[PDB]
């Protein structure tokens, strides 16, 4: 067998990216300032964090075992619980004390045959009293919100129609449905997309099979009152390339950024219209909604070249690290139109941005507040000379948050400091009567000066000032998505505005 | 109530002394080099580690909640398990989310009435299938060796005759007895010493009540074939001073270092002889034995002034940090002699030393190998300019280990590096047939460059070279005592030579 290294090597696991790999508890976290006492609930986040050194050199960040953090808040006190998802991969490699799963999304490189290849490392959401640890090549793994015990692979009481479940389901605040899909839904390289939904009682509602024009990565999607929308990243999969040990994904410069639109209820697969946006990278969706005229406004991060540069085109062509910027774009779509090509989008701000969140009380409807990560290259915002030698590689960088008011056009920027970077933020309604976008924002910070993580709590009245700074004595390695579960919400999700 | 701080402040909790306060697991620790595959067992160590910020400013290191680390070794792999002892203090303060116990060994400063004030933070030993987490003001707390679950306060099946159980019991390798005592055995300020022992079946054997000439600190003791020996540190307790908010301990320059000698079996309290060594500090006992003539050779660390300088005399007189050196001393005692004063001891080496370990297969008998911590002030051994600003205060420093062969006089010195310091080492017999002092030494290192801990594994054939270096991604705060429990020893303790 390929030799199992006994310590981590490579820039993807150096400095702040070095795995810690701890599970357990740290109660009564140190706090500078004061956590508002009305805040009650839990911030769940997930990070990729390899449990064992890979036999694949320079294994991407995206292929690390999912480790779940929960920050439990009550009466101005906070406790951390931390636990790895018990995926098939995790369990078998723990039993063997060596890595066994190979390249990202390529089963032909595995040292043993896996039934499920999930690292469950992308998102962690709440649904009907469980957490669902998500990875877009697999079904969810269900977990206990209180103990972070893994129950196992979840198939929605045998109703799950797809091999795959997106990392970005949407929760309709009015209907209380979880709206979902999976791509490569019948296996590696398939162009089948399964769109499906579940009512608040747990019963499956929609199930519509459709066909993608290419086998392209559909990481995120959008849901409006009457439509679901599938933006396709021009990374394309060829199973025959995989069989020879090649990458699951390869950039294709010759195709548009397809944007499928399907009626949300009652459709067949042939009802989908594959609109054609100018070539570019589909980043995360902030939110989408239908305006007065019934046209879809789709607000998402959008770049002009391959953000995932480590998977270049057929001839190895693509950008370098830190070259590609994504911008906050508005696309206008009309399901009635037979004109397939779409205009260039309008841009809402000029910042290099990603990881947009809204007040999810208006998800699928008109929103007027968006919170997002920014990466500002303006001199002095980040002390790169200090940070980069300590940072390792493989993960995106964010050196602030921004709050956009879409009515007024005002932008507030939170800057944690020259030697700190951020993860994705969460938004917490002040209380059940609060206005849209009024409450608290939390975000995990990497402090390169201390080589420790911190959890910042901000008030939306003034996003520039930390109301509290929760000081962890360990590193939480840069991660992906996270969610707030408020104690006052019986089903885990906030009430419609 | 005195206000509870919400983050740690003061030099006793700064830099490397900052509490981490984590409980749980880190399996498959990173290893540089190679852990010998024949090593099988567990290294248990305890550190003081305040779970909540104290309301007492500059609370000594000795008053921190005991947190147990177990390093589980098999086939060249190692896992860490870590868990706090569930003392009454720990549980009640966790329930309240604030500190409640006050000054070291002064119940008159507590905010609530405690039955048991143990922090269980001094030593962690194996006895009859349990761990015993030890603190000299209290009975032991019993724990599960595998899970580190706390069972609770342990009273030896209702046989425990004393309110106090020493942190330094001795395990007789021939008789398989645990030989014990407690001072302040009937409560605060009492001069009662209870000497007691347990046979390998768990039945109490000896129980002898005796009287100390002063209420002085008896931290360690010594056991030979026919005697038990009690060296008294000239720190003295006055309950009336405590009732006014003062220190439990106060140095007394006017008294000798008393050394009590009692027959090991069948004695009464009046059989004790209080010999009078020159005034000084009784450090840790390496070992004691009877020579050919029946005279006790007592080998221990011994200093000429108050090592615990933060508890000075009645007029605040005492030394400064880093001033007092302890040296490896041999005292000769004769229970037959009626001459109470003793000569100055001979010194075995010149190093400033502490934390002596022997091959416990010859405990209570003649030993010819001793391993110990050293602190070398010679320029370049420790880069003080780098280390001290990162170190915090409150804890002793050691920048190497030494191995003394007592027959040949040879000394080997392990120096981890200019920016590393050590804790107390453990010795592991190579196998059940190994000669005295032949095998492996392990020691926990504080790496001030990475702000991480490391566990070094050394072969006694060459103590200067690390065979392996186990790299923890977190800090284990400087701690106190630790022990090896070999898998091949059914009762947890090695077989006699
Ligand atoms: Co995502
Ligand atoms: Co001790």
Numbering used by the authors:
A (entry chain D), B (entry chain A): 30 to 526
Question: What sentences appear in the manuscript?
Answer:
Carotenoid cleavage oxygenases are an ancient family of enzymes that catalyze the oxidative scission of alkene substrates. The oxidative cleavage of alkene bonds by CCOs is accomplished through the use of a mononuclear non-heme iron center. It consists of an absolutely conserved set of four His residues that are arranged in a pseudo-octahedral geometry, three of which are engaged in hydrogen bonds with outer sphere Glu residues that are also highly conserved within the family. Taken together with the preceding structural data on ACO, cobalt substitution appears to preserve active site structure in CCOs without supporting catalytic activity.
